């Protein structure tokens, strides 16, 4: 029974999603909720947030 | 049981911390780790981060 906490991936994804300039507050909150619920998906969720950020570029 | 959700406090304090212009990268990352881990302490963490920012003004 390995204990995976996903510290590296989760902490990076939280920090990077806070940093993405083009997301609105509700979108950020949705990502944070997904991260809190399933840290194993942190890399996919960060990738999805980056795509959304880019699609909302000015 | 009461469910204290700190989604808004996290995003708001987190955005304020990550935008303080005089904090360095590891400082911001450390604050965000502490905030994610205990979001009930958002007010204290933001206050500490703001003081640090102001002590590092150019």
Author numbering:
A (entry chain A), B (entry chain B): 0 to 57
What's the publication's text?
We adopted the Z domain of staphylococcal protein A and its affibody binder dimer complex as a model system. To clarify these inter-residue co-variations discovered from the sequence data, we determined crystal structures of 10 coevolved pairs that spanned a range of cross-reactivities and orthogonalities (5 from LL1 and 5 from LL2).
The second library, LL2, used a more diverse codon set encoding mixed amino acids (F, I, L, V, H, K, N, Q, Y, D, and E) for four randomized positions on each of the Z domain and the affibody, so that the functional diversity (1.91 × 109) of the yeast library almost reached the theoretical nucleotide diversity (4.29 × 109). The highest affinity mutant from each library achieved approximately three-log enhanced affinity, KD of 1.99 nM for LL1.c1 (LIFFK/FILF) and 1.86 nM for LL2.c3 (LVLF/FIIV) compared to the original dimer (KD = 2.92 μM). For example, A-LILFK has more Z-B binding partners (B=77) than A-LIFFK (B=15) from the LL1 library, and A-LVLF (B=53) and A-VFLV (B=42) are also more cross-reactive than A-IVFF (B=3) from LL2 library sequence data. Although we could not observe any structural features that distinguish cross-reactive versus selective complexes, the thermodynamic properties of cross-reactive mutants (A-VFLV and A-LVLF) and specific mutant (A-IVFF) differed.
